Assembly symmetry: D3
Homo-oligomer: 251 residues x 6
Amino acid sequence: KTVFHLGVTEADLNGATLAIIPGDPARVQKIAELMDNPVFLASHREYTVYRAELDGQSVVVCSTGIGGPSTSIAVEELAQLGVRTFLRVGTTGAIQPHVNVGDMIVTTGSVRLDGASLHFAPMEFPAVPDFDVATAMKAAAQESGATVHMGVTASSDTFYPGQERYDTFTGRVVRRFQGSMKEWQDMGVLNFEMESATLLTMCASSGLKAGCVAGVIINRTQKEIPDHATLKETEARSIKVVVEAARKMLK
Amino acid sequence: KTVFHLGVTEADLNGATLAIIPGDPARVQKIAELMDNPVFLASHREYTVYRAELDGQSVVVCSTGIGGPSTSIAVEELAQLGVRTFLRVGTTGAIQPHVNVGDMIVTTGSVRLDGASLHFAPMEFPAVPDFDVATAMKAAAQESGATVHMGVTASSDTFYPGQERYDTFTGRVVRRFQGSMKEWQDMGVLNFEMESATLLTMCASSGLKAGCVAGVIINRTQKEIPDHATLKETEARSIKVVVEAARKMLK
Amino acid sequence: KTVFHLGVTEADLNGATLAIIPGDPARVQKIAELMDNPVFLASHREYTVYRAELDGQSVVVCSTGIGGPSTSIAVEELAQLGVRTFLRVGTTGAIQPHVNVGDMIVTTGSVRLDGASLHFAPMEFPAVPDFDVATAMKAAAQESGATVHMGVTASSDTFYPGQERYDTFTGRVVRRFQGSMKEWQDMGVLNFEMESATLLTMCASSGLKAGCVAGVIINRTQKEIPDHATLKETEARSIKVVVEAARKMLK
Amino acid sequence: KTVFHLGVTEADLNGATLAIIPGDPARVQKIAELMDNPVFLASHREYTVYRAELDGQSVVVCSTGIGGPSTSIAVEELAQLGVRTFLRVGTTGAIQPHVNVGDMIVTTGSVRLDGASLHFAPMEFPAVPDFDVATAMKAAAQESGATVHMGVTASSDTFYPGQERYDTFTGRVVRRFQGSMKEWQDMGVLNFEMESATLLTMCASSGLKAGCVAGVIINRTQKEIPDHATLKETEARSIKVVVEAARKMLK
Amino acid sequence: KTVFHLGVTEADLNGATLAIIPGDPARVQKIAELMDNPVFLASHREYTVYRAELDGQSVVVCSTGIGGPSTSIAVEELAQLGVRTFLRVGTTGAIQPHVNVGDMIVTTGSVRLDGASLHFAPMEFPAVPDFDVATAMKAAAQESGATVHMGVTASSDTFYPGQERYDTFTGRVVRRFQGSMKEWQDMGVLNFEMESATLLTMCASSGLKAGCVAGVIINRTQPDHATLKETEARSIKVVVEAARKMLK
Amino acid sequence: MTKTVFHLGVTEADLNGATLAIIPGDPARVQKIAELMDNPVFLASHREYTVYRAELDGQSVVVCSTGIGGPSTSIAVEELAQLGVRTFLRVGTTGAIQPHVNVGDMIVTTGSVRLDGASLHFAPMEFPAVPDFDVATAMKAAAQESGATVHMGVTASSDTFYPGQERYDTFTGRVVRRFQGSMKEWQDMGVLNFEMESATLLTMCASSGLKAGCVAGVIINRTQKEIPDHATLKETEARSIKVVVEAARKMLK
Ligand SMILES: Nc1ccn([C@@H]2O[C@H](CO)[C@@H](O)[C@H]2O)c(=O)n1
Ligand SMILES: Nc1ccn([C@@H]2O[C@H](CO)[C@@H](O)[C@H]2O)c(=O)n1
Ligand SMILES: Nc1ccnc(=O)[nH]1
Ligand SMILES: Nc1ccnc(=O)[nH]1
Ligand SMILES: Nc1ccnc(=O)[nH]1
Ligand SMILES: Nc1ccnc(=O)[nH]1
Ligand SMILES: Nc1ccnc(=O)[nH]1
Ligand SMILES: Nc1ccnc(=O)[nH]1
Ligand code: NA
Ligand code: NA
Ligand code: NA
């Protein structure tokens, strides 16, 4: 039946139980076109939905928009339509000097600097991926030839103060986040992004399998600008990797 | 000089210091066309940006996407480029029996059931609108002929469990939100939505003027299903009202 | 049916549904005498209660004492006796450099640095005034010829550490409140006082109408202890304004 | 030289290092007259201040008003003027069946259901009396012929919902306090009052010696209405006890 | 009825309603031998359990191990077997300059820097001793000749970062605990240890009588081996005398 | 290599270059683990800390008990880290709360619900109590290779045995508000089991540049009212320690 936001039915999905969920609606077609018979299903707000086939099995590709709230809607509605496995892909910036542009990160757990995760489980609950998904993502990332980092991701409800950026309109960062970047660095946290805490917490507490993989396209600690070719290659590699991770998850 | 997500420059805005900020990218052109000389500026992710003119003054119309996190990026980046006043328009679900479909709500304060608000101010800080904006929204709303409610809005990082919906994949609501709708009802809360706590807290703690006005499209307490015609006219009235409220702020 | 603390009955109030609620018991008579036929009703502990007539309608004046706890008792017991509208008048310390001694502040929202507000609503709930009362207070204040500020007030359970005063017995401030004044200043908070968070949260969550107006007796950017000379003039103008605000609230 | 709220100087105190601090301004003279050479010093707001002499030594008697906020002001200002020891006497509602109206309670620790305590120490810090003061209070109470109980007191910023009273304007108790009376009862808590958490935390964290002694005026488990005669004797005995406790504290 | 961890039955305790609870299993025999007819009952994990007689009445000595979690098990299981009064003894480091080695501290309340206390009562609840026990410990400590301090103890789930120790593997202390020693010092807190918040909160909220006494052996702000052994010997002599005062 | 740590009573030289530790709870289990490896030698015993050294495939390995709970565990981990240990393999017993898990099964923790206090002494509550991925992987492989039934998932890690695991057959029969209904809540959220050390261990290590993981044998299932069998508990513990030694083998190469 037609879910509230996504504008698709269970029949539209052709039995798909796995979704690849990028943030950017414009990335959906690109991911779908790496698979067989890509088909456009719907586009509403930040949700662009395609179906495709991978080794003869139906897979959904659905954008999430930025942030846990829009992500939580996409995940819930896809689950209502029979999806059980969710593969998050994106590109990210690193906060460790040893992590290079072109490297890939597979999240083993997220720092819950969001609000939506608390709508599924109290803060004590760990924002952790399904072990099978994380294993598949590591395997796919490594098999691509990239240097892969397994570790903790800080997942923030903001791009600016929650990631301790001072180059802003006010130049102010609330007490909670003052000195926070150095704290996460010292604790070995690899990167910031904005959706994994919500995704991982929601899925781990709701009987759904989820994981996160990302290509590194910038490093907060490095002054040097990466060249255009490296950015293109990394974005291309990240989606090739998520599709092969999906291959490894299919039964 | 070009902001990171919105893809616009200060020059693109032609001196605009006021923005109207709907959730849905598709609503941006619809708002802009109610004003003079609407021009498309940019579209990236959930962010569609137009400029227009109201009584000879430049105004920006920019979508936010769903939720506090994506909203916080749009507000920050517009503020970087000189925007100081932010008028939120949308549609909403009422939780009070006396609030009917077709009515308008102007938020006097938000229950902070989000995460991004905490990235700007600790929980004790009030999610409140600028008084001039709330005043102008009330006046514009009344002048349109619709019945207007001033009151508190519950602002949730989720559509489902944070609004205590049980017709879901798991059918569960975390302890925090069990019984929460009845709690807000008894406290006189008017409605649920998903962006105001973030918007109002961010602006009120950052020297920005903000307010929220919404048309009522559903009522959680009423079993009767509203007419298609009511929905249409409420949507049109919502954006007429927000443009008139903008006019009052510019005078 | 005599209420436990205030020592008055419903009959004593002569049909009054509106109360003016200053902090100081010795201030009650002065306010009542600005109106017609003032009548002493009772005095117990910090609660002195008078009745008077304003444009022919009965009005109650009742002191609250200092702080949310004593305020909460007065409001509850008045509400039991049929009072629905509460107008708070008081003194305050400005934390913005541009706000002058003698200026008036009308609170649009309070930072909840109290404990009693939490006995009525969780911290997420906004300490927000009734829109009609805030409108009436602004109008009364501006019409008087005063310089008036609308904005956020920090409402503290203490006069000393919670308002980051250092000229004290210990000269220490607990970690939570170290740097807090500068934080509130950067967030655009106008002033400090000690009852608004309790009053506004209690009322907004209980179907009662409330607002707060305050005369500035000190600017904290330059001084800690208010001086008694400028206090008398500011207080006299504050009570004229609250009386006019009551006039605007009568049906 | 003159403290802002209390309106007294260090010289006014004639070297007093100990204060007896009742809640009700009208109780101040009654306590002072049990000692030698009682002299009225000042009355401002809820603060009535007397000096007297006990075994040759100067003692201050100062009312606090209801609640932690007003109490914290009196304690601070008296400490500025050399007072180091604070003996609280007051009324209380017992919540255990075995505690009778007329009995006395000496608080060994307080459940911090207040806000002002947090302005001196984080919630982890114990709201505990000075051991010498608690010891002197127990001895004084026993020596008067009262039945005395040592134990934990629940200290609330409200009289009504924080003490789980439902006979109120709304008839509602916020989630936090629903079922709270039974919880404290099962935890062995003896009584409710409204000042001890603030007093004990502030003093224990500030190098001041404090304790609390109270007469039971009602039992929340008993339907029997207290005898007028017993309540009168109870009030009389409480103040005789606190004075003898002061005697024991002085050299 | 054999309890899950302690390996003893109600009969093993011979009617004891009072327990002395040191942290170190090796101190259990030492305490028991200060009394009459000491008898080994059981040793499992960090729990070594003896019985003895004091003025004709049975008393249990049972170690707790380090920390609130292991303490909470010992207390619960002893309470299932009829124990109602719990006397905690140990040695401790002071954080106030005026507190000297050889002095005794009797805890009047604990700063709850633990997690187990929250399993019995919310944070607002005071980690406070039973007044009779605290009174008996003060009396015994003073009667011994020691200088005694009645005051607040900071009770931490860690030895290292929660006591703001920087001489560690990482040299890092989490934000929460940065500057915390100075804060407790300025608030008049006497000392750090690791079990009192759990013990006191659990007992005060469960109808059990508890208190804590400790000998000062070092000072974080400022000792002879002869004085140190004397302090340890004195601490357990004091707790046995406090037990004597609690018997009815 | 010559300074003695405060609680454990060992020096760096005593460890013979060991960078990996196996950390059971029970001091009595230390020798039993050490004897599965080569040249086991007793080093020290103080309080709940019994320390042995052994050799695995020619590499020195430390076995050190933790006692019950986050606080005692945190001391052992810190002091071993001071002496050069970088990898920590926890082995223990656990109560399952899912009906599909059987007594005798093995659980490898993928993340812990932080119902402890010591984890907060290393990182704020938002930080995930997560194992090192290599350790969790080696534990899964070791457990599968022993023929055991293995479950990967979330563990609730409690500072108490009784109220924090929602047990009511206690002295008071009371459970504080926070924990009322909590076992059903974790059950519905897919949590596998209760134990008492993983939240502290995993948070401390993940935030301190140390590698850690947890494997446990199921001794009780809360959904099955069976009185623990003696022969079964012994069999479960023997298998558990075989698994953790094989997991260490995998980490050393
Ligand atoms: N700097 C200032 C000045 C005034 N006030 C207000 O006055 C009363 C206590 O003086 C309190 O009731 C409070 O509302 C304050 O809190 N801070
Ligand atoms: N049942 C009761 C009885 C008495 N009290 C104490 O008396 C004052 C409010 O009447 C307050 O100051 C409070 O200390 C109370 O709080 N609850
Ligand atoms: N950035 C942060 C640091 C510490 N605590 C938080 O909640 N957040
Ligand atoms: N630095 C960042 C890059 C991409 N996404 C983020 O959230 N942060
Ligand atoms: N934080 C909360 C959310 C919803 N309901 C509550 O009572 N509290
Ligand atoms: N019920 C609702 C309608 C519209 N928006 C919401 O967030 N919720
Ligand atoms: N410094 C210390 C000495 C003894 N015990 C502690 O916990 N801390
Ligand atoms: N049920 C349990 C068995 C073993 N350990 C625990 O902590 N809990
Ligand atoms: Na979005
Ligand atoms: Na008062
Ligand atoms: Na232990």
